[PDB]
Amino acid sequence: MIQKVITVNGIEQNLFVDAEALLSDVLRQQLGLTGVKVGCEQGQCGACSVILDGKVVRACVTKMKRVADGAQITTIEGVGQPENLHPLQKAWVLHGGAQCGFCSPGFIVSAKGLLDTNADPSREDVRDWFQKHRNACRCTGYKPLVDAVMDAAAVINGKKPETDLEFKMPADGRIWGSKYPRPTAVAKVTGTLDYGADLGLKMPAGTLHLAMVQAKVSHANIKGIDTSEALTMPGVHSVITHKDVKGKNRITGLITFPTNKGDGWDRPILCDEKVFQYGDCIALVCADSEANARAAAEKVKVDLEELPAYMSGPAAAAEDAIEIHPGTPNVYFEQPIVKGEDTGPIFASADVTVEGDFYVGRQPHMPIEPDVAFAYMGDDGKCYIHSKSIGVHLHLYMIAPGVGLEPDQLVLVANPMGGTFGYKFSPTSEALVAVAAMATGRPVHLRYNYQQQQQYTGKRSPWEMNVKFAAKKDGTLLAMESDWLVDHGPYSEFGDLLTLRGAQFIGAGYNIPNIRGLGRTVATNHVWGSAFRGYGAPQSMFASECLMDMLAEKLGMDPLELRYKNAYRPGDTNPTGQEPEVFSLPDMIDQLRPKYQAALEKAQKESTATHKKGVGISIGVYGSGLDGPDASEAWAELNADGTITVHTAWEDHGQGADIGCVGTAHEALRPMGVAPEKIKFTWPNTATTPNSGPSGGSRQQVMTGNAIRVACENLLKACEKPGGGYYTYDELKAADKPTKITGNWTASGATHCDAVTGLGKPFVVYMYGVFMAEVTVDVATGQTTVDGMTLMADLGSLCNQLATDGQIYGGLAQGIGLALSEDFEDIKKHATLVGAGFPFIKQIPDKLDIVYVNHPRPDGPFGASGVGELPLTSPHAAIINAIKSATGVRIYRLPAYPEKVLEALKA
Ligand code: FES
Ligand code: FES
Ligand SMILES: [Cl-]
Ligand SMILES: [Cl-]
Ligand SMILES: [Cl-]
Ligand SMILES: [Mg+2]
Ligand SMILES: [Mg+2]
Numbered sequence: 001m002i003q004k005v006i007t008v009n010g011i012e013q014n015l016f017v018d019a020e021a022l023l024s025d026v027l028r029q030q031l032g033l034t035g036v037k038v039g040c041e042q043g044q045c046g047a048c049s050v051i052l053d054g055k056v057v058r059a060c061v062t063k064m065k066r067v068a069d070g071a072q073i074t075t076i077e078g079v080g081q082p083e084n085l086h087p088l089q090k091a092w093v094l095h096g097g098a099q100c101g102f103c104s105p106g107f108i109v110s111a112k113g114l115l116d117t118n119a120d121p122s123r124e125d126v127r128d129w130f131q132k133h134r135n136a137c138r139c140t141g142y143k144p145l146v147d148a149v150m151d152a153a154a155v156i157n158g159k160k161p162e163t164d165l166e167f168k169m170p171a172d173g174r175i176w177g178s179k180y181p182r183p184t185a186v187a188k189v190t191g192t193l194d195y196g197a198d199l200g201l202k203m204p205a206g207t208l209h210l211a212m213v214q215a216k217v218s219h220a221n222i223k224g225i226d227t228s229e230a231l232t233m234p235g236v237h238s239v240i241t242h243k244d245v246k247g248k249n250r251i252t253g254l255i256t257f258p259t260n261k262g263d264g265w266d267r268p269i270l271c272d273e274k275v276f277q278y279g280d281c282i283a284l285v286c287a288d289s290e291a292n293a294r295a296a297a298e299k300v301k302v303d304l305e306e307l308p309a310y311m312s313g314p315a316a317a318a319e320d321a322i323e324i325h326p327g328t329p330n331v332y333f334e335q336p337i338v339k340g341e342d343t344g345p346i347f348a349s350a351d352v353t354v355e356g357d358f359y360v361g362r363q364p365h366m367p368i369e370p371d372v373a374f375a376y377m378g379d380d381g382k383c384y385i386h387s388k389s390i391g392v393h394l395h396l397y398m399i400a401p402g403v404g405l406e407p408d409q410l411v412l413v414a415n416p417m418g419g420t421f422g423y424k425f426s427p428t429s430e431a432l433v434a435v436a437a438m439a440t441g442r443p444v445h446l447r448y449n450y451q452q453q454q455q456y457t458g459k460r461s462p463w464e465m466n467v468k469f470a471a472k473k474d475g476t477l478l479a480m481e482s483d484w485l486v487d488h489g490p491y492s493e494f495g496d497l498l499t500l501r502g503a504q505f506i507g508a509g510y511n512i513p514n515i516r517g518l519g520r521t522v523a524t525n526h527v528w529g530s531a532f533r534g535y536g537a538p539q540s541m542f543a544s545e546c547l548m549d550m551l552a553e554k555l556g557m558d559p560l561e562l563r564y565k566n567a568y569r570p571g572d573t574n575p576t577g578q579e580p581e582v583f584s585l586p587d588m589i590d591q592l593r594p595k596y597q598a599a600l601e602k603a604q605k606e607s608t609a610t611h612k613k614g615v616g617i618s619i620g621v622y623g624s625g626l627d628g629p630d631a632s633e634a635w636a637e638l639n640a641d642g643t644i645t646v647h648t649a650w651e652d653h654g655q656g657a658d659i660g661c662v663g664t665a666h667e668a669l670r671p672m673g674v675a676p677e678k679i680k681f682t683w684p685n686t687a688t689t690p691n692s693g694p695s696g697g698s699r700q701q702v703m704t705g706n707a708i709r710v711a712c713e714n715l716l717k718a719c720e721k722p723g724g725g726y727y728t729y730d731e732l733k734a735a736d737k738p739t740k741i742t743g744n745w746t747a748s749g750a751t752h753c754d755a756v757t758g759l760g761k762p763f764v765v766y767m768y769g770v771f772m773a774e775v776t777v778d779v780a781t782g783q784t785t786v787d788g789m790t791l792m793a794d795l796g797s798l799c800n801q802l803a804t805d806g807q808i809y810g811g812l813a814q815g816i817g818l819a820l821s822e823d824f825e826d827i828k829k830h831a832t833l834v835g836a837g838f839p840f841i842k843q844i845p846d847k848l849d850i851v852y853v854n855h856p857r858p859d860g861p862f863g864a865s866g867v868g869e870l871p872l873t874s875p876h877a878a879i880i881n882a883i884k885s886a887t888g889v890r891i892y893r894l895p896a897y898p899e900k901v902l903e904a905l906k907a
Helices: 023-030 087-094 104-119 122-130 145-159 185-189 196-201 228-232 292-295 313-317 344-347 392-403 428-438 451-454 493-507 537-555 559-566 584-604 655-671 700-719 729-734 801-820 874-889 898-905
Strands: 004-010 010-017 048-052 055-058 073-074 208-213 220-226 236-240 280-289 302-305 332-341 351-360 372-377 384-387 409-413 445-446 463-471 478-489 513-521 613-622 629-638 644-647 679-681 740-746 766-778 783-794 847-852
Touching: 010 023, 023 048, 048 104, 055 104, 073 332, 087 104, 087 145, 087 185, 104 122, 104 145, 104 185, 122 145, 145 801, 185 384, 196 372, 196 445, 208 292, 220 280, 228 236, 228 292, 236 292, 236 428, 280 292, 280 428, 292 445, 313 463, 313 478, 313 513, 332 493, 344 463, 344 478, 344 513, 351 537, 351 644, 372 428, 384 428, 384 644, 392 409, 392 428, 428 445, 463 537, 478 493, 478 537, 493 513, 493 537, 493 613, 537 559, 537 613, 537 874, 559 584, 559 613, 584 613, 584 766, 584 783, 584 847, 613 874, 629 700, 644 655, 644 700, 655 679, 655 700, 700 740, 766 874, 783 801, 783 898, 801 847
Parallel strands: 004 073, 208 445, 384 409, 478 513, 644 679, 783 847
Antiparallel strands: 004 010, 048 055, 048 073, 208 280, 220 302, 236 280, 332 513, 351 463, 372 384, 372 445, 463 478, 613 766, 629 644, 629 740, 766 783
């Protein structure tokens, strides 16, 4: 141990530390500075950026011996606090740079290091700096962050007044459609919002820290577990196995389809008889600390009979394949799509047919914050779970029978979270912490490290796809055929539904009167499938949007013009036989056309012999809602102090659940003249908030937004004074009148897609968009650089521009990763941010362009559709179409690795 007298945030600290200790650990645990956020723990993400003697370092790979006596450290807490914001923190808030906010402290600290050395940086300087210092963001696509640096810089330089960093009201009082900052912005940019790991450091002693004992093979029969050595190890309380589980020890898929050949109880909470994938939790060590738990977990011995593993869809779908779940065939679900006439004869007689085999792989969500949960037995005897669940009511019913509790005896609460991008549509650690809390009686806490986040949370499921188009010489689509195989890993949850998405979205965007297709779901021993932003669209529309460009090339037609010809117009139906609710695609194409022609011209002019430039186009379509007559509930309550709380279980991945609530409520409350700062939101809690539903399927703004609008409309009626005006709280209570008002809303006109034909009206609101990608391909290396992305977006009406801009920028960046760099195929290699091809700032162009072409939705609140998954429907198709336009080569199987591109280039 050594004494180090240093300065931390301007205050002299008398530090007593292990020289080998990590600065991140010291700052967070010993000094309580949880504003230093830790994600990857491997120096790759920059979340832990601190300033050490004028240099930006990553505290997670800075050992205390590198901290000299009298050193000066600045963390986010020293940059500024809620009542004393730094220009960089004000700028972040104004520009909407905090979405999930997990990266915000590191980014702001890093940016402060930048401005202290380069006071008046260019946009490229900013990007260069964030690249060098490895500041990663998964939410924003970087543009708003650079916007914020530039604006703060102007203020610090004395070029602009600081008051210009404060939000200005639109001068009618309308925050709907505005750039009003999200309520959580201040806490995020000051590091005063407590995420799961932060809460764990602030829990009382007696809290047990968990570590997972995980399978180190992909497929096995378990013979026994030996905990003897682990129990003698330092800090160890006990080891939990399947024997300690009070219920079925199974997670249920809950809405398993009838034609599913599996019962949907295939997933264990703790492995009993079998290992189904690498990483499966077999046991939980409970100890006094994470470090001690992890140490002992290494010594728990599992006796395994290793079985052959099927590591892809095709391998597991073979006739001769051994059943992974005995009694259930590996191909456990099939969804046909049968629309209009038989396609066989139409394909035979058409002027032009095209066909293609396409692949989209196991994309890893890669949130900066790795999975974390905790649980405890309350004084009331209920079991409470606090996690990253983005569907608390959903997960309750998925886990309750497994852990052995009645629905009334378990409570699920969503912590503030650093992004999920769909992986939290699945339970990850909830049942594990419940089981541990129940068996021990003590508070338990479980934090995954980044490797576990990669290997042992759900992934986008790979699809092997064959799609075909039949068409007239004028470009009129006549028919389509489709076959898709979905590799869902060993756990069935929502696998059949994902498969159904192929029926709804392969070929979405165009009038296609005749379709014959078949989707198949298959269990494998690769990572289990959890929703990933887009959920079926990125796979489906990659195939159909690439094939649209192939059809265009065969016709001798401009790809944009071919789309203009076939795009939804009044009278047309989508693939499930349903009429579009608005018709905005022709409008969006027309407005993009000149930008597209201008991009083509630039591409040809600026191309060289070694660096070829191209332009690609795609369309994107997705539903807003869960399938069928989806519904939400909200409560509007006037409180004693004259504020209004809107109670919902609108789960915040980071997308802006808080601003969606406040924005929608304010618009609905306008007649009563309610200031936005007086409107409160609620963190999701199964006991104290209504079943608003999960934050999945880009549904909340529509479903819960409507429910909030109805609740607020009903509160107005309850507050309405006879003869005009409104009662106060005190007046209402004195009259013994209610002050907490319910509102519900239902997508009444929706129906589920039929099990035989795939036809129906699954969503009443869809999202529509047109993508344009501009790329440069280096033909010597096969390396693609995306120079610009454009999205024409119809969102009906914007609740909040900061939120929708950020959403789109974020999804476009994930499109670049999906197209060029991202995959989880090799269990070990792809277990880091860098190894799995996470897009750092230089991989994302500064040129991200949005054009809103809003066609108000009949069923949307004030006209709004969702936005969440739109920017990820097909941006990767536009990118791949752009590579083809640049070089003549088509990548059919994502991602377009440089070597892969080179191989095609030289074929
Ligand atoms: S770089 Fe330190 S937590 Fe990622
Ligand atoms: S706001 Fe950057 S990771 Fe979420
Ligand atoms: Cl998916
Ligand atoms: Cl390929
Ligand atoms: Cl490569
Ligand atoms: Mg027609
Ligand atoms: Mg090669």
